Every structure is written in C-alpha cells, then in structure tokens.
Design a protein around this ligand. Structure first.
Ligand code: HEC
Ligand code: HEC
Ligand code: HEC
Ligand code: HEC
Ligand code: HEC
Ligand code: HEC
Ligand code: HEC
Ligand code: HEC
Lengths: 64, 504, 504, 504, 64, 64
C-alpha cells in the first residue's frame, strides 16, 4: 500500500538529523525565515516522520 | 537454465529454471509477451485511437500486414538479390553484419577478445534445436532476410504478400532467448515497494504499454504528434533501437549515442547531462581509444574504457551485465511521484544504493561515490522542496477556483481523460484556459525542471542542477508563480473595492 | 555542356545547351550573378545601411579593396614565402590541400576511390582552356595564393595594394564551372507554383540577397548584430562555408558539421534535430568507419556510409548529386508561410515527395518512407493548426486595438520598415510596446516553435516535435496566450465597471 | 629561473628570478597559496556554511582526513595490489599513464614530437632534488599512488588511516613547479585598471575563493545545490579538472571538451558557442587528424591542427603557452560589470586586444582578425545598451517601490546577504516576491542573455548573438519588461480612479 | 497567382478523407469540443476545399 | 579608482566618432526615434565622454 506523504523539506530535515540526539539542532536545507536559515530540532522532525511511518503501517517495510 | 535471468521471472512464468528447456522458456515468455492482459495489443483505450500508417512498424504484432505488392514467391537468396536493388544499403549493411558472417564467429580463437560470440552462437543454435527450428547436427548458416522477416532457418519459398513480418522482440528472442528473457525480466524485477510506479515499470519491457496507457496519448486528436511519443516507446515491440537494423552491432548499442534519441529532452535530459558531465566529456574524448566491440563485462579491462557510459552503468548489476536496466532504479527520473521521495531512505532503496556503489567503485573509492550519491539524493529533495512550495500556492488557487478562466473557459479534455489540476494531459492538449498558465507553469516546474535537476545530479553535470537546468529554471518558475499570485491577489482586492463601491 | 545543370538554367541564360562552351556558360552565369537586378550589390535598401569592417569579407564584390599595406610587388612564390610568416597556418593548410598537389591528382589510378578527382581536374583544365586562361596543352600546375587572390594562372608580379581580391563564388567558378553552375541553377529550379517564396528562394544562390533584402536587417542600427545574420548568408558570395579555406576539403563539406553553423538555432534547428535523430546518432557513432573522401555518389557503397547525412539527403536528386539543394523542397522550414500548407497536396509537391521517397529508399522500403513522410506532413499541419488558433486570438486583439500599449506606446519601426502586426522586424527590433508581449509570443510560436516542430518532424527527432521542441513549447505559448487573453478581458470588464461608476 | 613565470610573480613572492632555487620558489608559492589572507580555507563567510561529505574532495587542504577504514599500513607496491579490485580502473588508467611509465619518457629521441617531455621529466627531477625529495644521482622511478597520495618519492610504509591525502595543486606543484607557478601567476597578472574584478580574478588560481566568497553560495540553505557551483570552481584546489585523474593526459586537457563541463551554460555558454562556430565544427570534424599529444606550441605545425581550440587560444600569450589564462582578458564574460565597458577602449584593453590579434593572425590576416574583434566589441556594447534601457525601467520601479510585492511580500535573503535590487543572490534564492518577476527577468537579461550574447560574439557563433542566444532572447526580455511595465501603469491608473471614487 | 487560403485543420480533415466516401465520418486531427474529438463528414470538408480551389482558379494546377 | 560610467550607447557613439570632425554626424548604433535611427553629432558625444574622463581623473590611465 501507499506511503503516508512526507514533504521534501521534512525528508531533508530527517536526513540531517540522522544519528543526532533529539535535542540537537540542525539547519534546514530549504527554509529561510527572517533572513536566517530555519533551525530544526531533531526531536521534532523525528516525531513528525515516525507519525507518518505509523500511519503508513505495513507500507513501510523498513529503512531509515 | 539462463543464469542471468532472475528467479522472479521463472517464478512468474511458473517455470523451474533447473528443468525448463529453451523452447519451454521461450514459449512461456512469449505467451506473456503477447497477452493483452500483460500489455500487448492496443491496451485499455484501444477504442479511442487508431493506428496511422507508420504504426505497422511501431507495433507490428498488432498492426503489421505484409505489403500487397510485390507479388513475389521468393527463396532465401532471392531476398538478397532483389533487395540489392530495392533496399541496397540494407543488403550492404546486412552482408557485413555478424548475422551474415556466422562462419567468422565459429572460427574465432579463444585469445580473441570477441571469442565470447562463438559461445553465444552455439547457445543460439542450442535454443533453435530445442525449438525444433534447427537440426541437432545442423549448424546455423546465417541470419538472413528470410530468417527474421519470414521464419527462422526457412528452407523453402516465401510469399511476399502473405509471409513477410516485421521482426519483433519475440522474433529476435527465438534465437537470442537470453537477451529477450533478461529484457522481459524487467517485468518481474521492477516492483516498487509501495506501487510508486506500476509493476515492471519504468522499463524497456513495458515502454510501449506505458505509451498506449497514457490517456492523452490515446485521447489527443494529433495522432502524428502522439506517434512521436510512440517512436521513443518501441523497445517493448522491437529490438533494434540501440543496436539498429540492419547491422545489429553490439558495439553500437554500447555507445551512449544509442540511448540518446529517447533519453533526452525537456523532461529527462540524460543525454545532455551525461554528455556535459566529465564522464561524458571523457567518453567523447576517449571514444576512439576504446574497443567498443568487447562486451560490457570486459569494457574496463580489455576494452580500455576509463570513463562510464550509459550502458555500462545501467546494465551493470552486482558485477554482471544483462539487458535488464531496472534493478538499481531508485528515483526513476521524476522526484515528485508520490512515494518516491519518501521511499528514498527505505531498505529497498538503500540496497539499490549499495548496488550503485558497486558500479561507481569500478573507478572511485566508495567514500567518494557515497558522498556524491548523498549529494544527488539531497540535491533532488532540495529541488522537490522548491517545487512543493510553488505547487501548494497554485493548487490552492485551483481549490479556491481562482485560476484564470477556471470557472468560465476551462473546457474538459478529450475522452477518456477526466478534468483535473496539473495533469500530464495538459502538456499535450490545451483549449481555452485548460490549463491556466500558472497551472502549466507549476506542472512544468515538476515534469521538466525538477526532473532535469535530478537528471543533472544523477549524471554529475553541475550546471545541470544549478545555473542552467534545475535550480535556476525552478527559481524562475517560483518567482513568476509568486509574482502572478501577488498580482492576482492585488487585482481581486481592487475588484472587491469596486464591488463595495457598487453596493453604494 | 554541363550534364548536371538543368535545362531551366540554360533557358534562363538564353543559351543552347547543345552549343554553349564553358566560356559562354561561365560569362552568362557571372553576368547574371553580378547583376544587381538579380541580387548582387547592396540591394534595394542600400541607402539605409553601410558596410562595417568585416563586410569586405562578407560581400567582397561590393566592398573589398586590397589592403593599403604592405606595399609589396609579389610573385607566386613570394605569396607562399612571406605568408609562411604572416599567416603560417594558411600556408600550411594550403600546402597540404588538393589545390597545392595537382600532380598527385594527375597520377591517381583507376582503382583509387578518389580517381574521380583526376577527371575533375581535367574538366577544370578544359574549362580554363575554353576561357583562354590556360594553354590547350598547358597543365594547370597548382591553385596557389596568387591564383585565387589575384588571377587564375597568373605568371608574373602582383601589386599587393592593387591586385589582391577575396575569392568569390565566380572566382572559384572560373575553374569549378560545374559546381558554380549547379549552385546558380538554384535560381532557376526553385520556382514556387504560387510564389510562396520569391523565385530561386530559399537557396544558397540567393542567401545574401535574401539577407540584405530583409527590412529589419537593413533598418536596425545595431549593425554588428545584423552582421551576425550576414555571416549565415554568405554562400551567394563565397564558396568556403562548407569546404572552408584554406584546405577546401570536400570530405569536410560532406560532414553534417559543415552545415551546422548556419542550419541551427531557434527558427530552424536542423543540426540539433538531425544529430539527435537515429540518423545523426548513427552518423556520430560511425563517422570514423566511413570514407568521407569518396564522392556522395559513392558514399553508401565505397564510403561505407550507412546512415544519411545532410549532404547525402539534400544534394541527392533523382539518383545524382549536385550543388543544387532546392529541388526537393516542399515545406521550406516555415510551415505558416501563406500558400505553403495549401500547396502540400499539389502535384508539384507530390513530385518532390516522390523525389524524397527515392532518397529514403536507398535504405528504407518505400512503404516505410512514405509512412513517415505522411507523418511528417500531417504532424506539421497539426502544429500549424495549433498556431493558427493562437494567432487568431492575438490578431483579433490587434484589430480591436487592445494589445498592451497598442494605442499609447507603440512607436514605429525604423525606416524603411512599415508598422504592422507580428512582423519579422519585431524579432530584432523593439521599442516601448512595439511589439506587445502577446504579439511577440504568437510570432515566435510560428517563427521558432512551429518551425522547429517541422524541422524535428522532417529530421526524425521525436522529442523535437513532441516534448522538447514543437508541440510542448507551442502548447505553452497557446496556454499563455489564452491566459493573458482572459486576464485582459477581465481587466476590461473591471475597467468598464469603474467607468460606469464614474458615469455616476 | 622559470622562463614562463612573470616577473610580477617573483616580485610578489619577494624572490630573485636568477637566484631563487626550485625549493624556494615552491615554498614561496605554497605559502601564498595556503594563506587564508590570499584565498585559502573557508573564506570570510565560513561561519555561515559547513562542508558536506563531498567537500573533502573539493577543498582537501581544509576538509580532507583519510578514511578511518581500512586499517592498513602499505608500501608503494601494496597500493596497486589492493586497489586493482578496490578501484580497478584507477589502477588500470594509472598503469598506462605517463606517470607510471617514466622510462618511456627517458627513452624519447630528440626528433620525437613528444621529446619535450623528457626535458620536463628532468626539470621535475631537478625540482625534487632541490627540495630534497630525490637524491642528486637518483632517478625518479615513477609517480605512483603513494607519491601523490602520501609523499613524493616515499620509500617506506604509509598508514592508510593517517597518511593518505587528496593531491592538491601544491602537491602536483612539488614536481610540476613550472605549471603550478604559471597557474599561481594568475594572481599577479590579472590586475584590472579600475578594480573591475578583484586582483587575480577571474582566474583558475582563485576560482574556489571566488565561489566561497559569493554570498548566496555561503548563505543559501540548499548546500547540495551550492556544491554544484563548487564543482565548477575547484581548479584552485586541485589540478585534475582538465587533464583528469588518473590518466593525467595532457592530450586530453588540450581538447575543447576538457573545458566544457565548467565553461558552459546559461551565463557563459562558451562550450556551446565555440562548438557551433566554424572553428569548433572544424575541430569536431578534424579531431582525428590532429596529434593531440604534441604540446600547444607545436599544435599548428607538428600536430596538424588547423582550427583553433579553447586551450590554443586562451593559453597563448605573446607566442608562448602557459597555464596562465588571464593575460588577454578584456570583457571577462559579463559585459555589464561596472567599468568593463568603459575600459574596453583603454590602452590596457588595446594592448590585450593586440595580444588577441597576435593569436588570431597565426591564421587570419590582421585586417580580418581586427575587423571581427571590432564587431565583437561593438556587438557586445549593442547588447549592453539594450539591457541598460530595460534595466533603467525596472530599476526605477524598484527605487520608486512599485515592484510587485515589493512592500508587502519581499522577505530578506539569508544572512549575511543584504537586501537589494537585481542581485546575484536572487538567481539562487527566492522567497515570496523576493525577487519580483520583472526584477529576475532584467537580472537574467544581463546575467544570462547579455553574457551569452558576448560569448557568442567572442567565439564566432552568429546564431549565438542574433536569433538563438543574445539579441533574440534579450529582445523578448525587453518586450516583456515593457509589456508588464505598461500593464502595471494601467493598473495603477485604474487603482487611482477607484481611489478617487472612494474619496467621494 | 495566389492560392485561396485553407486552414491547417481543413487540410488535415481533407487528407483524412483521401479515398473515403463522402458519407464517411472521420475524426478531426485538431479539434476537441465538449470533451470529444470533433467528427468530420468527408463530403463536407471536400466541399469546403473544392470551393477554395474554385477561388484559386488556375493558381491550383492539380494535386489532391 | 573607478571609472566615471559611460552608457553603452555613448561608448558606441564615441567609437563611431573616432577620426571624425566634431561637425560630423553619425548614426546611433542603438537608438530609433520617430521611425528613424537617431543621428548623433560627434562633438556632443566627444564632449560627453571627455567630461566623464575628467570626473574619472587618474582612474583613466589613457586610451581612446
Ligand atoms: C523483388 C523481385 C523482391 C524479392 C525477390 C523480395 N523482395 Fe522484399 N520487397 C521488394 C519490394 C519492391 C519492396 C517494397 C514494397 C513497398 O511498398 O515498400 C519490398 C519490401 C520488403 C520489406 C518491407 C515490407 C514493409 O512492409 O515495409 C521486407 C521486410 C522485405 N521486402 C523482405 C523480403 C524477404 C524476406 C524476401 C525473401 C523471402 C524478399 N523481400 C524478396 C522486392 C522484393
Ligand atoms: C537466429 C536465426 C537469429 C535471429 C532471429 C536473430 N539473431 Fe542476432 N545473432 C545471431 C547469432 C547466431 C549471432 C552471433 C552470436 C552473438 O550473440 O554475437 C548474432 C549476433 C547478434 C548481435 C551482435 C552482432 C555483433 O556485434 O557482432 C546483435 C546486436 C544481434 N544479434 C541482435 C539481434 C536482433 C536485434 C535480432 C532481432 C531483430 C536478432 N539478432 C535476431 C542469431 C540470430
Ligand atoms: C554512472 C557514472 C552513470 C552513467 C554513465 C549514466 N547513468 Fe543514468 N543514472 C546513474 C545514476 C547514479 C542514476 C540515479 C539512480 C537512482 O535512481 O538513484 C541514473 C539514473 C538514470 C535513469 C533513471 C533510472 C534510475 O536508475 O533512476 C535513466 C533512464 C538514466 N540514468 C539514463 C542514462 C543515460 C541515457 C545515460 C547516457 C546518456 C546514462 N544514464 C549514463 C548513473 C549513470
Ligand atoms: C587494502 C589492503 C588497501 C591497500 C594496501 C591500500 N588501499 Fe587505498 N583504499 C582501500 C580501500 C578499501 C579504500 C576505500 C575506503 C572507502 O571508504 O572508500 C581505499 C581508499 C583509498 C583512497 C581514497 C581515499 C578517500 O578518502 O576517498 C586513496 C586515495 C587510496 N586508498 C590510496 C592508497 C594508497 C596511496 C595506498 C598505498 C600507500 C593504498 N591506498 C593502499 C584499500 C587499500
Ligand atoms: C610580405 C613580404 C608579403 C608578401 C610578398 C605577400 N603578402 Fe599578402 N599580406 C602580407 C601582410 C603583412 C598582410 C596583412 C595585411 C593586413 O593588414 O591584414 C597580408 C595580407 C594578405 C591577404 C589578406 C587581405 C585582407 O584584406 O585581409 C591576402 C588574401 C594576401 N595577403 C594574399 C597574398 C598574395 C596572393 C600574395 C602573393 C601575390 C601575397 N599576399 C604576398 C604580406 C605579404
Ligand atoms: C583553378 C585555378 C581552381 C580554382 C580557382 C579553384 N579550384 Fe578548387 N580545385 C581545382 C582543381 C583542379 C581541383 C582538383 C580536382 C577536384 O575537383 O578535386 C580542386 C579541388 C577542389 C576541392 C576538392 C579538394 C578535395 O577535397 O580533395 C574543393 C572542395 C575545391 N577545389 C573548392 C574550391 C573553392 C571553394 C574555390 C574558390 C575559393 C576553388 N576551389 C577554386 C581547381 C581550382
Ligand atoms: C613527481 C613525484 C610528480 C608529481 C607529484 C606529479 N607529476 Fe605529473 N608528471 C611527472 C613527470 C616526471 C611527468 C613526465 C614529464 C611531463 O611533464 O610530461 C609527468 C607528466 C604529467 C602530465 C603529462 C602526461 C602526458 O600526457 O604525457 C600531466 C598532465 C601531469 N603530469 C599532471 C600532473 C598532475 C595534475 C599532478 C597532481 C595531481 C601531477 N602531475 C603530479 C611527475 C609528477
Ligand atoms: C579563438 C579563435 C578562441 C577560441 C578557439 C576560444 N576562445 Fe574563448 N575567447 C576568445 C576571445 C577573442 C574572447 C574575448 C576576449 C576579450 O576581449 O575579453 C574569449 C573569451 C573567453 C572567456 C572570457 C575570458 C576573456 O578573455 O574575455 C572564456 C572563459 C573563454 N573564452 C573560454 C573559452 C572556451 C571554454 C573555449 C573552448 C570551448 C574557448 N574559449 C575557445 C577566443 C577564443
């Protein structure tokens, strides 16, 4: 079945948070707000992706 | 057994690879190959379109009938003699091809780099014997006009008006069962984890199916435009698009130019990106130093090849080469296809990334290759993010009904197409304000510029994802989308002010 | 008599083909060639433009004077000796050219594939003797600097400040009367049944006339931009754009690359379409296996050539090859030219289609070639239909006076151009809102995208009439035209509402 | 002394040409090369960006650490043994390279056109002896993996996890002092009269510095997009972008294709313009007649080369060929850069024009070469004028605050970029209406179309400054700018009337 | 002299009607109305083209 | 230091007026007005450029 959609910016942030602590902060790869690259907390993006993976169910057969 | 054919194919054909004869394998392959349920024939929209004259060469199994003239009953050498006048270059090219020089192949010595061809000839003969087209002690004397165009190893006369055929993939596969089965195995090895693309696609095995199952292709009235599409989509039907008739030279098919007529252009500029990359520029500079006649397996050793080429990268899989080009596919050209980006981190994609790392590390260190492929993946997602932001704006206009002409001049596309927003049909058919400009612009941002951005990244052409293709053009589409969006908001604010004034 | 020169040329020159000598034929050809009534000189708008420095090389007969420096009186050997230092690569190229090695041509043996050049040298000598430039038993010793740049077979001293010339087509035609006459015969064979183009055009014989008779070329102030046009339009004046100075290699001029500098780009992308077709990719892949030194007559046998090239297709006519490239022309690149599309079913066009079929059927079956040429014609008309719909919208806006700035900021083009809708001048000159964006877009839709669509069809590059050139870009133009048309109607509606409110 | 190194370089290094040993010249070059004040390291915006994985190969001196695995200690011979299947082609290409065959170089005879290489070998040996890397009686045995990747002439074991380096320009320069010094001399020979570009730029010596000193490159979040820029800008750091690893073939770097991956695309289409020019089409047609192995000095004589190439034109200066490509630069690609057009008539530009004339007149007469270079200069200005007119329109709207979204949706570019009108940042970053569409259009009009116009003029591709690149696209930009300007005026007028009605 | 203009869509329907009966109905190559390719009755387009050829007079010297 | 700017059209008019008398009149290379290429009096453009070169001062190290 289909994968629950995940935006490209969230995929990017998720990859950037690979092997990071949930408290670590990384730069966005795509978002600029108020003249600064947005900073993303790895805990938030990981939660966001995991909840898409939960919604995917058996569609996600494994991987990062 | 054909060791290079995946197990998935013997499973799908309900064959035991340890026991199936060549004849059994061929017959099972061809039954599927010719079954409308598996993509043969006119497809699900055959009622919406009819062949034009050239279609008899594009899909001969459905459409080819021999010519009503000449009324000739010809033997094998009659073909050659008459066509020495009617199609003289075909005869000249055929005469100097391997097909017409099989005794040369038989007499190759084990120290010749082309010696593998003798084994292939002997396998062909074994195939034909299993099929009962060739005696157990009979050598294949040649592959001549009558063989491909009438019947393999035909000994008697042919009626030109009844018996001529255009040789399709199953014709070649009568002899070249291995290559035909490797090709057909793409049906079985290209299964996306989440059905991102239909099973066995994208692939050469199903390129014609993919073509005729495209709604606007069936639906548009401009048949000669649509057949342009078909000319890029005939690998399924005939085997002469990389190694062309009538020379059928494997050396030709190994050259990047063989892929370029099809794998080029505004929505997949592989030829342009590849040839501009250092890889392709080196291939251009060094082409006359390489022995293109050695098989792909020997290209980098015996062949002297020191830069990668389309065929070497895409037919390589786990250190071997087969006609199946699907087994390392991860992005499949269009990054925005639902589920493709999300699947890029899966175990399925990582394992194909591992296979790609094996290809690149014929030359580069794994560390180098992996660092670039990481750039490819993330660069593609960066492009996709830019598109997704622009699409959200225009799609919201669609859902709000504020696209130009959306409610006044948006005629429905031709049957059996269904109306919608930013659909492929709008690239090949337009009427009134279907599509709107912003809609076409954001569709082309994905179909053309994001796709070409990804191709440039995959094929290491820096300009092809930054200034010249990809980022730059996507930047412009984004800018004009935001610009028109602001102008449309400003105009509707002005209209509202007028509407308020009319309320007195 | 020149077997390859058509009757129409002898009739046009008031010559009897059964009586005319090389001398009489040459003088009548050159008389017409240098007649300003037949296209020589500055043309009908010479009062509007002046040569620039390089114009002396582009139109030498009108503009060239020899340099004031150096002050040298020089004999034949002096040219070579001093230019060995002044222009060393010219002397090196000349020295290894056929022109400098006529004795090698004299000694060619009948089994040499280049043997025909011996016959050609004897015809040159026959020409020169008829002209009184060579003794009847005097061998032509060489074609050296002093021959081309001063006088053929000059025996004594030349004054560098008075006697140097740039060799124009009639200079070469002194010796190469056949080729010059064949080229000039384009004036007489390219007669459109309804004057769709001026008689003799399009052709290489009149390309420079066509250039200087283009209003915007004469009228625009950016002369260096305009001379870019001139550089593609000098075949009329000089014979070195396909086989270049100073090697003058016929093998070079047979290669497709020879045509590419002129036959490319946004309004006729023949180089790009041909090279992307299978034909052109095959030519790229096999160029090293072909003997480019054999004449086109021998290319497909002695030359090994197995894919078609520009020269083999376009110089072939009824089984012969001449420098006349006009006799199979039917569409002439621009499908929207009044009368062209209507003429495509005429007996006249059908006879040229039959001539094309003869060209394709050196290789393909006639049923195959005809099926494709049918697709070419119909696919061109489908593109034309798309343009015609879009043009009807914008042209009506022009007639309604409603193009942007049409009544407020549409200054007149430079003299002698006259104001009008969607005129060629608007591609190379613009000011204010002349043209309007919609006007330029619909003009470019015909001039660029429909032309390229046809070129892609004619040269069998499927992406070149579907996705990448032609249909896709024309689709976008139509969409944007329709979009702006609706926006402009909605703006007019809003202005009418505000005008009503001001009527209180 | 190094005859080809300019005095300005010895002066900048505080060296005496006569006395400075190879080792002292090298150390002085390397000290400047590695000095952050002179362009090394992360540059002034290092706080804003971090390397990505591939950056270790793009700027090794700043970012490279050897792999943590494999844990191996290796002698010279062990590199080849393990890498023969770890990185097979690197070994195969290295094995047939000149670096692996120095004995063939020693045995070259003085009549061999490649003999100069024996002298280059002895000069390398003399350099290494001065640096203490080679005994005075010790011949350089080879240049193997361990020499470039660990230490020159290394005699003992290397720790794969600690001692592996990526060879940078200073690594090659250890042996190839002349070529490295010539390259570095670009820092000293490229002083603009009025600081039109920074001293030493544009150049290969400072290309990476120029990249990392570009604000949007440091500022933009899409690092994989930004690293595409870096890949065209690594000559400063590594010497293998023209003669690539691991063949390191000087014959390859002399081919135009070697330059094409970087010198191509939407803002400098040198590859495209040159290859379409007659020069480039001749180079394509004649590439297999030329001996690319002779040095550029001998190309026109011993190499049989008869058409100019990128290297032959741009590495030539006053009759010598060196790695310094800056000394005839006048326009530097972008004609709109402040002070560049005004400087084109200076004595400084005229002396570089005289140098260009000396290049062209190896073939053309001076009169011809000057008449074309005059066309190039005036044609470029004609393009600049068209852009200046369009820019004045859009710039005035920016200054007046009337660009679309300018005061309502124009967010600031990422730090440390400062907001502005038509800035380079707006080609690689956009958000909301920053930039506005008109603003991007007029920026691209200069950055892409005016640039390509000049590249087309400079490289003699007539379509490349008229119809296809340059004038035509600039014409459309002008037309669309003027069109939107008029629409925006008319809209403002309508809004002003609705404001009047809301005042009553 | 000059040929009476015939639109491309008419030329196409004319060519679609080559060797058809006047009562045969063919699909347009260009026109879609109400979500369907327009059908063309061959007798009609032949009449359209012949009346243009009548206006061309001796400018049309023969052909399909 | 920096050059006083001179528009491209003025540079072109300046080049057109090389070895021309101040009273000589040449055509613009860039400007069309009222349907005619603008004509430029050489003394006006020479004066225009010379005053720019004066504001450039020592920045202009010589040339035409
Ligand atoms: C003349 C005496 C012929 C002999 C004997 C054979 N062929 Fe032929 N062939 C001939 C002609 C004149 C044509 C052209 C028909 C047309 O209208 O194009 C052909 C064509 C073919 C083709 C192409 C068929 C198509 O649909 O395009 C093929 C594949 C072909 N011929 C094959 C062929 C074979 C296999 C023959 C020996 C059994 C043979 N031809 C004999 C003339 C003659
Ligand atoms: C038996 C009657 C054959 C049929 C039908 C086809 N091919 Fe063939 N081909 C055959 C043999 C015995 C050989 C030599 C063995 C080998 O595989 O090399 C070939 C050769 C080829 C080649 C390679 C030619 C070369 O480069 O030397 C190609 C590319 C090829 N064959 C393709 C091919 C195609 C596309 C066919 C259908 C149109 C086809 N063959 C039919 C035997 C037979
Ligand atoms: C290795 C150096 C390559 C060569 C040479 C060519 N291609 Fe390629 N291709 C390569 C990669 C790493 C990728 C992306 C793989 C992924 O999905 O992650 C691609 C992609 C393609 C595709 C899409 C299929 C796919 O594998 O995703 C196509 C159709 C394709 N490439 C075609 C192609 C052409 C036509 C080439 C020569 C002109 C070519 N490739 C060379 C790696 C390499
Ligand atoms: C195996 C026993 C090795 C021997 C001995 C040497 N090398 Fe090696 N090398 C080896 C591997 C498995 C790898 C790949 C590491 C990876 O993750 O890709 C490498 C890598 C290199 C590289 C690339 C370094 C990089 O950062 O990409 C280089 C330049 C290299 N090796 C050079 C090298 C030299 C000079 C050796 C002799 C001193 C040598 N290697 C020995 C395996 C082995
Ligand atoms: C020096 C002692 C010369 C001898 C004797 C001849 N030529 Fe010459 N030529 C010479 C120079 C220095 C130049 C450059 C002139 C310039 O300003 O560019 C030339 C030029 C030519 C040209 C080009 C003319 C043009 O308009 O560009 C040609 C065609 C030419 N020369 C031909 C030529 C011939 C035929 C000679 C023997 C009769 C000859 N040259 C002698 C120097 C010298
Ligand atoms: C007599 C004095 C000549 C004049 C003037 C020109 N050409 Fe010539 N050319 C001449 C001869 C006797 C020959 C050998 C016979 C032959 O036709 O081959 C040639 C050769 C050529 C060629 C072919 C060279 C080759 O490819 O081997 C070409 C393409 C050619 N000539 C062109 C040419 C041009 C363009 C001329 C004016 C600039 C010209 N020729 C003048 C004799 C004479
Ligand atoms: C000494 C230990 C060397 C180092 C480090 C590098 N090079 Fe080398 N190279 C060296 C010699 C003695 C020679 C032969 C003499 C000559 O210059 O020809 C070379 C050769 C080359 C060549 C030309 C090879 C050919 O085409 O025949 C090139 C292009 C070259 N070298 C480049 C090069 C680069 C880029 C280096 C750093 C990565 C490099 N060399 C290092 C000796 C040594
Ligand atoms: C001579 C016949 C040339 C060849 C072959 C190539 N280039 Fe060129 N280039 C040439 C000129 C006359 C100019 C303009 C010089 C000036 O007035 O400034 C250029 C310009 C460039 C530039 C900009 C640097 C400069 O000198 O202005 C670059 C980066 C450049 N050219 C690159 C380049 C490439 C990549 C080529 C092969 C594809 C190439 N040039 C060939 C002259 C000639």
């Amino acid at each position: 079945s289909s994968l629950a959609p995940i935006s490209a910016k969230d995929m990017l942030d998720y990859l950037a948070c690979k092997d990071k602590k949930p408290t670590d902060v990384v730069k966005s790869h795509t978002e600029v707000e108020n003249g600064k690259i947005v900073r993303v907390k790895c805990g938030d993006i990981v939660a966001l992706v995991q909840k898409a993976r939960e919604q995917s169910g058996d569609a996600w057969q494994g991987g990062y | 057994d054909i060791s290079t054919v995946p197990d998935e194919t013997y499973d799908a054909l309900k064959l035991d690879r340890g026991k199936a004869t060549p004849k059994e394998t061929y017959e099972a392959l061809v039954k599927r190959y010719k079954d409308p349920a598996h993509g043969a024939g006119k497809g699900t929209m055959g009622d919406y379109w009819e062949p034009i004259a050239i279609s008899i060469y594009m899909d001969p199994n459905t459409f080819y009938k021999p010519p009503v003239s000449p009324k000739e009953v010809a033997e094998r050498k009659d073909c050659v003699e008459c066509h020495s006048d009617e199609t003289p270059v075909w005869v000249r090219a055929w005469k100097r091809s391997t097909h017409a020089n099989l005794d040369k192949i038989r007499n190759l010595k084990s120290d010749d780099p082309l010696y593998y061809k003798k084994g292939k000839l002997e396998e062909v003969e074994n195939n034909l014997r299993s099929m009962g087209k060739l005696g157990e002690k009979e050598t294949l004397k040649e592959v001549g006009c009558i063989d491909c165009h009438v019947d393999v190893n035909k000994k008697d006369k042919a009626d030109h008006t009844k018996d001529i055929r255009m040789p399709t993939a199953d014709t070649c596969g009568t002899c070249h069962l291995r290559e035909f089965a490797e090709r057909e195995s793409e049906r079985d090895t290209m299964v996306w984890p989440n059905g991102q693309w239909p099973a066995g696609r994208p692939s050469h095995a199903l390129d014609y199916t993919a073509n005729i199952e495209t709604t606007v292709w069936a639906a548009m009235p401009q048949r000669e435009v649509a057949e342009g599409c078909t000319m890029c989509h005939t690998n399924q039907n005939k085997c002469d698009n990389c190694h062309t008739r009538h020379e059928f030279s494997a050396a030709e098919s190994r050259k990047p130019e063989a892929c370029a007529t099809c794998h080029s252009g505004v929505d997949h500029n592989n030829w342009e990106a590849y040839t501009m990359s250092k890889h392709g520029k080196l291939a251009e500079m060094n082409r006359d130093k390489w022995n293109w006649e050695v098989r792909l397996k020997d290209a980098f050793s015996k062949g002297g090849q020191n830069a990668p080429t389309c065929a070497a990268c895409h037919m390589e899989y786990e250190g071997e080469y087969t006609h199946n080009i699907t087994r390392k596919t991860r992005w499949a050209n269009y990054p925005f296809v639902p589920g493709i980006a999300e699947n890029i981190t899966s175990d399925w994609s990582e394992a194909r990334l591992d296979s790609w790392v094996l290809t690149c590390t014929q030359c580069h260190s794994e560390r180098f290759a992996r660092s670039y492929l990481d750039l490819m993946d993330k660069g593609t997602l960066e492009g996709l993010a830019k598109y997704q932001e622009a699409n959200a704006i225009v799609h919201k206009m669609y859902e709000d009904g504020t696209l130009t002409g959306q409610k006044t001049n948006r005629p429905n596309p031709p049957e059996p197409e269904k109306p919608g927003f930013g659909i492929f049909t709008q690239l090949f058919w337009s009427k009134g304000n279907n599509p709107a400009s912003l809609e076409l612009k954001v569709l082309e941002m994905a179909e053309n510029n994001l796709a070409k951005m990804h191709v440039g990244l995959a094929h290491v052409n820096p300009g092809g994802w930054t200034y010249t293709e990809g980022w730059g053009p996507m930047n412009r589409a984004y800018v004009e989308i935001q610009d028109e969006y602001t102008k449309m908001q400003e105009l509707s604010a002005l209209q509202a002010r007028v509407n308020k004034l009319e309320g007195k």
